Amino acid sequence: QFLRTDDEVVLQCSATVLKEQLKLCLAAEGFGNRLCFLEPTSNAQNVPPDLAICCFTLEQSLSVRALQEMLANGHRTLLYGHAILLRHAHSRMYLSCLTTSRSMTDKLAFDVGLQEDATGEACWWTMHPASKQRSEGEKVRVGDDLILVSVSSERYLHLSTASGELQVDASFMQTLWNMNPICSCCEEGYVTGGHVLRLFHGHMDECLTISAADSDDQRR
Amino acid sequence: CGGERYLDFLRFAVFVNGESVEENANVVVRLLIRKPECFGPALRGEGGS
Amino acid sequence: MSFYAALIDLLGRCAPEMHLIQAGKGEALRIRAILRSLVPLDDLVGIIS
Amino acid sequence: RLQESISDFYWYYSGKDVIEEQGKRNFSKAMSVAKQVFNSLTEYIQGP
């Protein structure tokens, strides 16, 4: 129905390449690569997309003045104009914006990255409605279109395509991001999708498995 | 020619007497950035700087 | 020449403030980071020649 | 919108300890207006 705090969601952008629409999500592995990249999810019928690292979650939502007064020192509903604190679910690191240089565009790219930044200086975003139909202080309909702006650097998160592949940074213009409710507060003691878990067989001690390590069987 | 006249006005609304009054100055930069086309296309663009 | 010289003149006095505020606060530092990120010092130092 | 304004005003004074004289003269102006609005809303409902 509507977005709430403590919910797990995924970003989504749509940019055509071969005169046909290709859905592109935002994800990063975590340990070993502080940068972030794009994962195509347009051929699910043949290409299995990797959604183990695409999951995000919403932890905080505050007004700009509340944020700025907190900087010196339940379950809410999102409204346009508030701030936000993204949080990568798997690696448990906060999405932010770094101050490095990439793509050599002689520009204001400031490529995106997530390190640890619980400290509130560059780890926050404010969201605005895209079209004139919506306005500030309005409840966020599921499946809307958002525009995200860095609180610190004040740059739109730009899907900056170039001569090479498609890259993400915050330099020049808007980027229409569509939200997606992966899941919500599930019920205890019930199986849900996206879990990692074991498969016992029989009564007491027996389970599914694969061949051991250091073998030429290629785990088949 | 036209640009050099509008900008000359803004110089008199950012300071009044020896580098002061920042409230209107603060909103000028936050507003000017919103329209990147305000910068001359020789720099601050996509082609080159 | 008149245009770009006048534009940087605007964004030299639209600076956050004197060090009265920049040395005892954290709001004005946000503006200083923005304007410093638009004019690289390496090219700026060479322009006086 | 008025409610979002007063709550906004509260944060500006959250870190202080005493409200100065000009911090109350304007504040009482807004709350008096909000009371008048609330009176109207009742009189569209009174007399079911």
Swiss-Prot record, chain D:
Family from the record: Belongs to the ryanodine receptor (TC 1.A.3.1) family. RYR1 subfamily.
Post-translational modification summary for this protein: The N-terminus is blocked. Channel activity is modulated by phosphorylation.
Tissue expression: Detected in skeletal muscle (at protein level). Fast- or slow-twitch skeletal muscle.
Subunit field text: Homotetramer. Can also form heterotetramers with RYR2. Identified in a complex composed of RYR1, PDE4D, PKA, FKBP1A and protein phosphatase 1 (PP1). Repeated very high-level exercise decreases interaction with PDE4D and protein phosphatase 1 (PP1). Interacts with CALM; CALM with bound calcium inhibits the RYR1 channel activity. Interacts with S100A1. Interacts with FKBP1A; this stabilizes the closed conformation of the channel. Interacts with CACNA1S; interaction with CACNA1S is important for activation of the RYR1 channel. Interacts with CACNB1.
Function comment: Cytosolic calcium-activated calcium channel that mediates the release of Ca(2+) from the sarcoplasmic reticulum into the cytosol and thereby plays a key role in triggering muscle contraction following depolarization of T-tubules. Repeated very high-level exercise increases the open probability of the channel and leads to Ca(2+) leaking into the cytoplasm. Can also mediate the release of Ca(2+) from intracellular stores in neurons, and may thereby promote prolonged Ca(2+) signaling in the brain. Required for normal embryonic development of muscle fibers and skeletal muscle.
First and last residues shown, out of full length: 3925 to 3972 of 5037
Subcellular location: Sarcoplasmic reticulum membrane
UniProt miscellaneous comment: Binding of [3H]ryanodine indicates that the heterozygous channel is activated by Ca(2+) concentrations 4-fold lower than normal. Single-cell analysis of cotransfected cells shows a significantly increased resting cytoplasmic Ca(2+) level and a significantly reduced luminal Ca(2+) level.
Binding site for Ca(2+): E43
The record's note on its domains: The calcium release channel activity resides in the C-terminal region while the remaining part of the protein constitutes the 'foot' structure spanning the junctional gap between the sarcoplasmic reticulum (SR) and the T-tubule. Pore opening is mediated via the cytoplasmic calcium-binding domains that mediate a small rotation of the channel-forming transmembrane regions that then leads to channel opening.
Protein name stated in the entry: Ryanodine receptor 1
